[PDB]
Design a protein around this ligand. Structure first.
Ligand SMILES: O=C(O)Cc1cccc(-c2noc(-c3ccccc3)c2C(=O)NCCOc2ccc(Cl)cc2Cl)c1
Length: 253
């Protein structure tokens, strides 16, 4: 039953991610106010990490922290869904490795907002204007994600949808190096059907939300590809930086 499949996943989502969209959205609106980060002053105030010699590189190390923690929650999430863990440990790793960042930007969108994004599970808010004022290499690597999130959040999906959405992303039998490609495709088609079903149910007036959402899934594949290339260049031109060994493993390709 797809209805039972969409709920089981949704709960796996509720149990593995610290920041849900429901919560994030209310903060970015009400309840209590986050600490705004817009310069050396405030960023440290908020932190009151590898060796950094400037603000830009510093923020670079921040994002990594955010993405490492997310890769962790995503692994736990990806494991909470039975079928996935049945796959060979290798492929399990493959799926995560190549789909990890797509799952990250899609969810981070839930934390994003026109003027900035929430950090440390809502504790603070890093303004977009601050990010645009960093050395060219770093300023424009974060920006694309802002434009993506904004358009993405527009489809106005909720955690119940996201749960399925990121599942359909992590379980992509199209990643390079999969052993049992067919079994992955099998699992994904179930997810995609639970996704299909669920949407038409949860958002009945959004007629093309599904084919439209699948496209956003494509924009992410593209978004990450460009991101990896920029990571590449930051590794090549900003010899002073470095990346968490975990990210070091994911960016081996
Ligand atoms: O490649 C990695 O795995 C890590 C990495 C390295 C360099 C740039 C980005 C990257 N490019 O755009 C994004 C991005 C932008 C807007 C919304 C969502 C994502 C991020 C990203 O991972 N952001 C999360 C942390 O946001 C933080 C946290 C703390 C601070 Cl003080 C500042 C920032 Cl901006 C990620």
């Amino acid at each position: 039953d797809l209805k039972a499949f969409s709920k089981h996943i949704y709960n796996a989502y509720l149990k593995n991610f610290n920041m849900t969209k429901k919560k994030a959205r209310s903060i970015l609106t009400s309840h209590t106010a986050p600490f705004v980060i817009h310069d050396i002053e405030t960023l440290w105030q908020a932190e009151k990490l590898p060796p950094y010699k400037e603000i830009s590189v510093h923020v670079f190390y921040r994002c990594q922290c955010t993405t490492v923690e997310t890769v962790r929650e995503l692994t736990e999430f990806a494991k909470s869904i039975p079928s996935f863990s049945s796959l060979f440990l290798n492929d399990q790793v493959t799926l995560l490795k190549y789909g990890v960042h797509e799952a990250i930007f899609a969810m981070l969108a839930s934390i994003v907002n026109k003027d900035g994004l929430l950090v440390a599970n809502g504790s603070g808010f890093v303004t977009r204007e601050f990010l645009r004022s960093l050395r060219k290499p770093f300023s424009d690597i974060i920006e694309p994600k802002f434009e993506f999130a904004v358009k993405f959040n527009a489809l106005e999906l909720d955690d119940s949808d996201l749960a399925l959405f990121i599942a359909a992303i992590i379980l992509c039998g199209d990643r390079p190096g999969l052993m049992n490609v067919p079994r992955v495709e099998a699992i994904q088609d179930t997810i995609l059907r639970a996704l299909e079903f669920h949407l038409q149910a949860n958002h009945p007036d959004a007629q093309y939300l599904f084919p439209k959402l699948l496209q956003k899934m494509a924009d992410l594949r593209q978004l990450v590809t460009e991101h990896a290339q920029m990571m590449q260049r930051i590794k090549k031109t900003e010899t002073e930086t470095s990346l968490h060994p975990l990210l070091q493993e994911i960016y081996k390709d």
